[PDB]
Amino acid sequence: LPPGWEKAMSRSSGRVYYFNHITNASQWERPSEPARVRCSHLLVKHSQSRRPSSWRQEKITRTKEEALELINGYIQKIKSGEEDFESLASQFSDCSSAKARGDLGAFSRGQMQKPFEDASFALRTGEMSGPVFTDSGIHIILRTE
């Protein structure tokens, strides 16, 4: 397995899957570094975020648990095809990059919060993370280049 990836079995079906403890991604297939990557993200903030406020809501009072439930709902919808990542980032992301469909542009190591940076650089091009926790809130990250 490449670094970051481990083998697991589904608790409901027993079937083997793979999970990445740096990005929190999980997938059924056995999976197998640049100066910069470009990512988009969708951030859902909660009451312990460093600044609990966004263009969506002046005072954010959801718990960290409620934020993760929202994140997991958006991941489901994106993986199902029912909604596009871009569409959910524009509507729901608690960051001003929502107005750019969640795009953050290209960045190097050194610029972003560290868990965000590590997950971004551990994703393959086109791959989406699972929930990624930072002091700003909980992210879904899409590596676009």
Side-chain angles (χ1 to χ4, degrees):
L1 288 175
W5 284 103
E6 93 218 344
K7 156 186 299 186
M9 322 182 95
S10 173
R11 282 289 154 90
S12 58
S13 77
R15 203 154 104 237
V16 167
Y17 67 102
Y18 295 82
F19 160 79
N20 184 299
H21 61 85
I22 300 160
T23 64
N24 289 325
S26 46
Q27 61 182 57
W28 294 112
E29 300 185 48
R30 178 184 239 261
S32 62
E33 92 163 11
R36 317 210 297 165
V37 298
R38 189 180 179 173
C39 292
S40 300
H41 81 137
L42 183 164
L43 162 71
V44 174
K45 281 189 172 186
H46 43 82
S47 68
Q48 292 184 239
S49 306
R50 187 133 141 61
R51 321 163 21 237
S53 195
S54 73
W55 72 270
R56 308 193 60 222
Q57 177 173 37
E58 186 157 22
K59 163 88 159 178
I60 289 173
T61 56
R62 78 170 67 86
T63 58
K64 174 177 189 157
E65 295 76 13
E66 293 170 316
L68 178 60
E69 189 76 316
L70 286 161
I71 288 276
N72 287 331
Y74 298 146
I75 284 174
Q76 286 172 37
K77 281 145 86 215
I78 294 162
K79 290 194 159 177
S80 78
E82 289 160 54
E83 301 273 3
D84 283 350
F85 180 96
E86 291 85 347
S87 173
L88 296 182
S90 299
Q91 297 171 255
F92 300 122
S93 181
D94 283 315
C95 186
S96 69
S97 56
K99 310 291 160 202
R101 297 156 326 272
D103 177 41
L104 292 175
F107 62 81
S108 306
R109 290 204 177 261
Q111 309 179 212
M112 299 286 182
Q113 292 158 314
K114 181 77 184 153
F116 188 101
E117 164 184 312
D118 290 341
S120 293
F121 278 87
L123 290 167
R124 296 174 304 254
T125 293
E127 182 186 10
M128 185 175 76
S129 71
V132 172
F133 294 82
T134 63
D135 295 335
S136 305
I138 301 169
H139 307 252
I140 303 155
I141 307 174
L142 175 65
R143 182 177 168 201
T144 58
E145 318 166 352

